[PDB]
Amino acid sequence: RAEYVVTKLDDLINWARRSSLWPMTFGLACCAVEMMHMAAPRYDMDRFGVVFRASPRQADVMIVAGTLTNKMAPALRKVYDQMPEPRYVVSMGSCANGGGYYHYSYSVVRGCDRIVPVDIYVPGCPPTAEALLYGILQLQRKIKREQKLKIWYRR
């Protein structure tokens, strides 16, 4: 019936978004390096849909790797604000998830989340590359559960 049709159709909508996430890393990190190793031959990220990364306008997920210092904090917000609406943020690192080896310093944002909402927090100083891959896969499980069409029908 109508309920079944809109459950199946967002299952389609969700499959398309999670299958192909094009992510743009914020670099600025020791975490970025690890991210690179996820793009590399050992744990190809492309195989999962993620791409070797594209620009801000065409990016579905932003991975903030590395300390978001006070001077870079305005820039992260504008790039987050310059992305298409279906848009998510994965915070890699224990220096973007809060503070870090560098936590209490005059120039360090205590969590990139403060600047922009964060969907999955990957923990680890250099979150092991597999970790990030688990975190990206966890975003894909979060994207599967979302039911935007059902909520509009149940409006």
Binding site: S94, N97, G98, D119, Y121, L133, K142
Partner: protein, 172 residues
């Protein structure tokens, strides 16, 4: 010792123009990439074939428990006095047995740096840093571990921790 790195008869002149005009030298690169599509990719099937690690791999913390069942942590404060990220708060009491144990223990896993300065300082092998690295979270609160998300955590991996401790104890 030092080494220099970058330092005409028609035979040579024609050879130069045979490598500039009928490009023959960008071809030694095209065959070079053709040599790799026919090799075996290094990619591992990720979720099913997780990559290789070592018994030394430092990940999610956990509080080991004596085989009897007695927490090993005796609230020394020898592990926040060294934790450089200033992440641990272990307020303690006499536990009403007369014994000496924590009422409080903490890591803020969004401040920790997985340096293992807490597993090598602990004179009792209570706090370790397990081989987890799939513990990402959708929220900030699930990373501020308490003594009960570290003790039942250590009530989980103890079959998998002790093998690695017993495997590396001599080298440590």
């Amino acid at each position: 010792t030092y080494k220099y790195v970058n330092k005409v008869d028609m035979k040579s002149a024609t050879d130069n123009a045979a490598r500039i005009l009928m490009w023959t030298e960008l071809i030694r690169g095209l065959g070079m990439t053709l040599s790799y599509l026919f090799r075996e990719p290094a990619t591992i099937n990720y979720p099913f074939e997780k990559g290789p690690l070592s018994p030394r791999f430092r990940g999610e913390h956990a509080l080991r428990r004596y085989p009897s069942g007695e927490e090993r942590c005796i609230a020394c404060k020898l592990c926040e006095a060294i934790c450089p990220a200033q992440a641990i708060t272990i307020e303690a009491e006499p536990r009403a047995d007369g014994s000496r144990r924590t009422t409080r223990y903490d890591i803020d896993m969004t401040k920790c740096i997985y340096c293992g300065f807490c597993q090598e300082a602990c004179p009792v092998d209570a706090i370790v840093e397990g081989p987890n690295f799939e513990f990402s979270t959708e929220t900030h609160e699930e990373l501020l571990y308490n003594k009960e998300k570290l003790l039942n955590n250590g009530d989980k991996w103890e079959a998998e921790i002790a093998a690695n401790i017993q495997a590396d104890y001599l080298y440590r």
